[PDB]
């Protein structure tokens, strides 16, 4: 799997990566605080 | 003193008061052959009848007494009372408001 | 997204656009299913004041139909309850239950509008399922918005406005449509009645639009219609442009004026703290209260005269021209 | 100048949270003055920063030309 | 890691890094300031 | 079967796969946000 490397351009692979990574984080971190349960600075209970 | 409602009184003849559970309308909606007068909600056993007692459908009247053995399609199961309000009110908030 | 077929009906004259299209996928069909009646018990021997201890308002009605009015509020307001969810356990004579008081005003409310109304309910008439429809609480009631005394020097002051709002059918428009015209009377009017102005006369803010466009939107998904079933857009102020629906709609408005002011509010001060709103209100009545997003509330069943009890006596001093329009004298003092 | 007015009082309407900005964005607006104000400068958050944003707006376009 | 700068260039990767955290320093604490219990500005009791 | 790679270009299938997959993914797991029975956030009953 080296040989990916050959294939893909290195720095557009881990602008793409970083830029998915990125965002998820953002999203995951935002679905969390729009739910009541995982809402960690809402402070609510379970 | 705590004279007995009438089977034939208009007020009886509405309901279905009967004295007896048997010769009740069996083939009412509203009925299952386990309801007597006894286990109804709205009624409240006589200090000193002994067989009679007070029936709410009938303002509680002391002339008006209902037999514990008897039925009207007004039956309600005592089972009630149990819980009183909108069971998502709580009680402290229930009487008055 | 929605697909074919959608059911169409003509409002106005063919080319105007006045159309109704709704999709038939979209209706319940449960929601709207009238309850069965019951039979009819006799109506013979002493009326129910002369027999009941604590009678103020069903006074008229004979043991045998007072218990059939009984058990038919019971499976439309509370039916998983029972008779207790009014009364205090096994003494009936007792008034201690807040859901007793407001029943008993619920009954002298259900009377009135049934004997006065006829302006807007024509002969159906309704009953306690027509707002409850099976449920402890009116699952189509509302609230005011509250008020927070704004800052006056900070940032962000909506005016009632510039928020998604379930209220305002998800328009920007003025949220306390309802304060203004379902409770308090504040004019609906915002077309000019010339050719040419008179603006200290008539001048009418474009908030103010808003506001009575937002109470439109509102009429209009709360009965299933929208504003080509009661107005011409092109001529929206011409009365006799419009179809006989914006009459009735009308006296819907004075109706449900006359509900939440007369008979709604009064309740606000013995309810419980969990039931007020924000605001500490009391939840009120709007147009999809009775109608749940149709023009005839419960398929247009009439469920009245099957239930003696919730028919009242048609009051000598009913106008219905008395609340906001040419004179107060139907509404209290507080309204909102 | 008037984006960061506008952008600041919409964000402030939501009670500052991006998320309901995101959620609230077509809906938030920067309300003008209320009726009773007429001509007059009214206070800042009752249409007084609408009014700062119209002008510095007007007066960016007119720049623009 | 200093091969990263061999192949993401390092003049637009430490400008976008600013930028970037820039828009997510100024959300974190705009988010804070939305919840109640973190809003300093306010003091609502924690 | 690799002369699947002597018909497309796979250097761009493997990057369009990989962003198929996600829009995929992510239609999948918010479906599932949406729905009732398989919204682990929401924790409702089974
Ligand atoms: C998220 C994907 C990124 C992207 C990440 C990568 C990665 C990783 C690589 C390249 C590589 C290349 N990219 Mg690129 N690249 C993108 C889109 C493009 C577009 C275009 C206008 O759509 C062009 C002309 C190029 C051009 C190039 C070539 C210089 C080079 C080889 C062609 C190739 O593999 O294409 C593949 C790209 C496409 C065929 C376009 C895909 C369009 C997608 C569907 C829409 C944008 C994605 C968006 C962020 C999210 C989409 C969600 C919805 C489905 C729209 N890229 C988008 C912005 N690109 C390779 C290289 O470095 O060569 C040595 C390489 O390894
Ligand atoms: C009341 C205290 C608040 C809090 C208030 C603030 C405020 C205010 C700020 C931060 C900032 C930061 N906080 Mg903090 N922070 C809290 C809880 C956390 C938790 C946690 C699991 O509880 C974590 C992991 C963090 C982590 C971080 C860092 C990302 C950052 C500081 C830079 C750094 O040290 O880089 C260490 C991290 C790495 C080296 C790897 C991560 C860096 C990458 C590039 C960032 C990706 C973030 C990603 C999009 C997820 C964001 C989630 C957010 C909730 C949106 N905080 C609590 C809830 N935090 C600062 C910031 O935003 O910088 C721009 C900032 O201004
Ligand atoms: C609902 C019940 C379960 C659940 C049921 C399932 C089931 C069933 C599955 C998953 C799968 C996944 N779940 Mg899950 N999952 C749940 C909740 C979550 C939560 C969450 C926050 O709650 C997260 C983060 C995840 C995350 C995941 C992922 C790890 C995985 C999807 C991979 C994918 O997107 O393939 C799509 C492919 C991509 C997104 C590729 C894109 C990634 C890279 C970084 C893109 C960069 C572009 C690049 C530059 C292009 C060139 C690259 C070249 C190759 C060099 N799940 C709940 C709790 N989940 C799937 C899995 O296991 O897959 C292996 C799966 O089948
Ligand atoms: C592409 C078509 C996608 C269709 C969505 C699949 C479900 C269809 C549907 O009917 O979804 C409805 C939502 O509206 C919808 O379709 C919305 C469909 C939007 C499609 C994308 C349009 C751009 C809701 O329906 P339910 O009663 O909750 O169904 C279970
Ligand atoms: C041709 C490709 C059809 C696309 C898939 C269709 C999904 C199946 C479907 O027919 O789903 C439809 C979604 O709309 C739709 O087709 C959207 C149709 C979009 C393509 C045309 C259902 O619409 P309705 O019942 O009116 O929704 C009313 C409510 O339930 C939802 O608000
Ligand atoms: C085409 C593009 C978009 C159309 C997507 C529609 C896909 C089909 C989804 C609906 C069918 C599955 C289903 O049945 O989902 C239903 C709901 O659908 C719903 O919300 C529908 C919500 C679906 C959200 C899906 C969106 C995914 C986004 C795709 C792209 C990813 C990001 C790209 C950047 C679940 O119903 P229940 O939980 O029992 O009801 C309870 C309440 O929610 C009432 O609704
Ligand atoms: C927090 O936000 C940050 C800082 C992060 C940045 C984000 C900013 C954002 C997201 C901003 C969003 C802005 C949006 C979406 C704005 C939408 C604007 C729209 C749709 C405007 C549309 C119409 C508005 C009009 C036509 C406004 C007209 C106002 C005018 C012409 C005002 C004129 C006022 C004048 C000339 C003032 C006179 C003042 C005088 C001096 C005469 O008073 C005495
Ligand atoms: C619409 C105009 C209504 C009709 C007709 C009837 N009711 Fe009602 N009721 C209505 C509203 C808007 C509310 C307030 C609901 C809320 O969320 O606060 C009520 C409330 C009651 C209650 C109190 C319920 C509770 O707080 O738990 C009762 C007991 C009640 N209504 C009974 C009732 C009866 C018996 C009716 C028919 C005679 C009746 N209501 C009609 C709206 C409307
Ligand atoms: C019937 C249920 C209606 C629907 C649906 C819509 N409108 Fe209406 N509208 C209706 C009435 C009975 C009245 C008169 C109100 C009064 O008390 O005088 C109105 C009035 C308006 C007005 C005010 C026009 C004027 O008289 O100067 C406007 C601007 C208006 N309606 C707009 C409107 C729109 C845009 C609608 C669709 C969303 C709409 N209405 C629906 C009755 C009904
Ligand atoms: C319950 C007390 C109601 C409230 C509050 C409102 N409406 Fe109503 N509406 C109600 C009934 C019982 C009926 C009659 C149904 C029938 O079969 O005749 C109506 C009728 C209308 C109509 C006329 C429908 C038609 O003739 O086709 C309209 C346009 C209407 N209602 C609209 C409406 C609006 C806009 C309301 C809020 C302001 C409103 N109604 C309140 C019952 C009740
Ligand atoms: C709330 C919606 C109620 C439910 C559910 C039930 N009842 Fe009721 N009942 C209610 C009120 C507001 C009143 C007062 C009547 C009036 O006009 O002022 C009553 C009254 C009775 C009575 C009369 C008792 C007396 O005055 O001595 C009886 C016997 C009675 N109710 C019986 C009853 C039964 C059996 C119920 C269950 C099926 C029941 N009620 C439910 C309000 C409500
Ligand atoms: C930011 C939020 C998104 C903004 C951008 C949205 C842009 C797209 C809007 C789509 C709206 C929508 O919900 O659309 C849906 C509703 C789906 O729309 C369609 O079905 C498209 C038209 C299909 C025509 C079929 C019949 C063809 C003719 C037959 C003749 C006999
Ligand atoms: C851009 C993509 C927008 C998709 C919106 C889908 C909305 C589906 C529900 C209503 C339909 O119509
Ligand atoms: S209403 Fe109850 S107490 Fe009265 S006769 Fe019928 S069953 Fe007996």
């Known amino acids: 799997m080296w040989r990916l490397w050959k294939l893909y351009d290195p720095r557009r692979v881990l602008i793409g990566i970083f830029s998915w990574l990125a965002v998820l984080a953002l999203v995951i971190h935002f679905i969390l605080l729009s739910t009541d349960r995982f809402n960690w600075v809402g402070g609510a209970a379970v | 003193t705590w004279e007995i409602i009438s089977e034939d009184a208009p007020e ?72 009183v309000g909108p069971r998502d009110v709580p009680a402290d908030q229930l009487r008055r408001g | 997204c929605e697909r074919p077929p959608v059911d169409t009906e003509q409002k106005g004259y063919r080319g105007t656009g006045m159309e109704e299209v709704n999709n038939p996928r979209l209706r319940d069909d449960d929601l709207h299913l009238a309850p069965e009646a019951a039979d009819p018990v006799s109506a013979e021997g002493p009326r129910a004041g002369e027999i009941y201890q604590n009678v103020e308002v069903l006074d008229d009605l004979s043991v045998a139909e007072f218990t059939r009015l009984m058990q038919s509020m019971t499976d439309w307001v509370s039916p998983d309850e029972g008779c207790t969810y009014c009364h205090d356990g096994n003494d009936f004579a007792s008034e201690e239950l807040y859901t007793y008081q407001v029943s008993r005003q619920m009954i002298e ?21 027509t707002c409850h429809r099976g449920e402890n609480l009116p699952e189509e009631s509302w609230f005011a918005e509250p008020t927070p005394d704004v800052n006056m020097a900070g940032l962000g002051n909506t005016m009632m406005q510039n928020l998604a709002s379930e209220k305002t059918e998800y328009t920007s428009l003025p949220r306390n449509a309802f304060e203004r015209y379902l409770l308090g009377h504040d004019d609906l009017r915002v077309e000019g009645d010339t050719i040419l102005p008179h603006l200290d006369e008539w ?22 219609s929208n504003c080509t079933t009661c107005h011409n857009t092109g001529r929206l102020g011409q009365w006799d442009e419009s179809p006989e629906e914006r009459e009735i709609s009308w006296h819907g408005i004075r109706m449900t004026r006359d509900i939440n002011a007369n008979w709604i509010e009064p309740l606000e001060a013995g309810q419980p703290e969990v039931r007020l709103g924000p605001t500490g209100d009391i939840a009120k009545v709007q147009c999809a209260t009775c109608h749940y997003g149709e023009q005839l ?3 247009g069943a009439k469920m009245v005269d099957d239930y003696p009890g919730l028919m009242g006596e048609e009051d000598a001093d009913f106008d219905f021209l008395q609340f906001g329009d040419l004179g107060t004298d139907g509404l209290r003092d507080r309204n909102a | 100048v008037s ?10 309407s939501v009670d500052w ?25 009214p206070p800042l958050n009752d249409g007084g920063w609408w009014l700062i944003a119209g002008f510095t707006l007007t007066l960016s376009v007119l720049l623009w030309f | 890691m200093w091969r990263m700068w061999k192949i993401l260039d390092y003049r637009r990767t430490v400008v976008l890094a600013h930028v970037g955290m ?25």
Not at chain 2, 61 to 74: M, T
Not at chain 4, 6 to 11: Q, S
Request: charged share 15%; with cysteine.
């Open chain 3, 203 to 224: 001048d009418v803010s474009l908030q103010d639009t808003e506001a009575s466009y937002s109470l439109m939107m509102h009429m209009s998904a709360a009965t299933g």
């Open chain 3, 109 to 129: 409310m259900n009377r009135y509008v049934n004997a006065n109304w006829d302006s807007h309910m024509d002969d159906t008439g309704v009953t306690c399922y």
């Open chain 5, 22 to 46: 820039a828009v997510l320093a100024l959300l974190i604490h705009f988010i804070l300031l939305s919840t109640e219990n973190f809003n300093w500005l306010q003091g609502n009791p924690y």
């Open chain 3, 297 to 299: 509330p419960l398929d």
């Open chain 4, 3 to 12: 984006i960061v007015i506008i952008g600041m009082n919409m964000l402030a």
């Open chain 4, 17 to 41: 949270s991006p998320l309901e900005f995101i959620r609230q964005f077509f809906w938030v607006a920067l309300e003008p003055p209320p009726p009773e104000y007429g001509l007059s400068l």
């Open chain 2, 12 to 83: 009886a003849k509405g309901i279905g008061y009967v004295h007896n559970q048997a010769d009740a309308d069996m083939d009412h909606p509203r009925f299952e052959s386990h309801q007597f007068c006894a286990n109804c909600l709205l009624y409240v056993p006589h200090e000193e009848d002994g067989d009679h007692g007070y029936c709410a459908a009938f303002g509680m009247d002391e002339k008006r007494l209902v037999n514990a053995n008897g039925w009207c399609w007004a039956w309600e199961d005592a089972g009630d009372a149990a819980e």
